[PDB]
């Protein structure tokens, strides 16, 4: 159900997030709350965005 009047905010409700980056597709009914920097290249960059 639409919830603009509950979870919107002028300037952006940045309290809601989504995971653009992880190694493999999420298994069905799995959740991962880990916020670990996504190494998309070969070089280990010591967790700096």
């Amino acid at each position, epitope marked *: 159900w639409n919830s603009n009047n509950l979870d919107s905010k002028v*300037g*952006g409700n940045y309290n809601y997030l989504y995971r*653009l*980056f992880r190694k493999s*597709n999420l298994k069905p009914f799995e959740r991962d709350i880990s916020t670990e920097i996504y190494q998309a*290249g*070969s*070089t280990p960059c010591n967790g*700096v*965005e």
Partner: antibody
Amino acid sequence: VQLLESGGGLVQPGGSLRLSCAASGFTFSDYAMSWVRQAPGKGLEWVSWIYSGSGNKYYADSVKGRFTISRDNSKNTLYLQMNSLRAEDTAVYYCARFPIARTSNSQSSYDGMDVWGQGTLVTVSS
Amino acid sequence: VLTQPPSASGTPGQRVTISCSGSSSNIGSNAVSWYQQLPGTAPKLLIYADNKRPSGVPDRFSGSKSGTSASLAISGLRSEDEADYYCGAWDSSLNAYVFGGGTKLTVLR
């Protein structure tokens, strides 16, 4: 998807001004943004690149210090403050959307400068 | 620096190979991209990966990165195929998306 630049015009040498790039048609926060310089009748000279304000901003070796790129995801705009402008910078500036987020099935200009705005023209001359 | 030929050419219907080369930091360990800038227009990304091609681009625009040399193969040239073809790759060392010199493709009429 459209990127519209504004702020291109007459600039006194060593002057200061602000290119504003209004981006519409895509989720502005998900794609990196960049500025690309093209001297009149010359090749594409990359200006700068950004993804997050708190992250690392990348600048060309010739513009390090005198240029400042920034975002405004609330306004879906990309800003470029250029100050202490030098003579060779008279050019056309393109605001280019640099996708960095590839998804599983959706294959989209990942890491390619995807869409380029019409570009404004900056004249650094007295 | 992605060392790229200044002006390659070929007759219409031919398969022209635009081969640029940088370094391991330039292109060997990073994804190369190929852009087609027609005169007076913004560049269009023809190749995004070392090989892959975005949708909306003719299938003839093939790309292949062998080691440090990236080849953009344009097969079946036409009056719309004449443009400046740049190769660009991120640098792990210099930290810059270094472009190629810019190959000026022209058709043999």
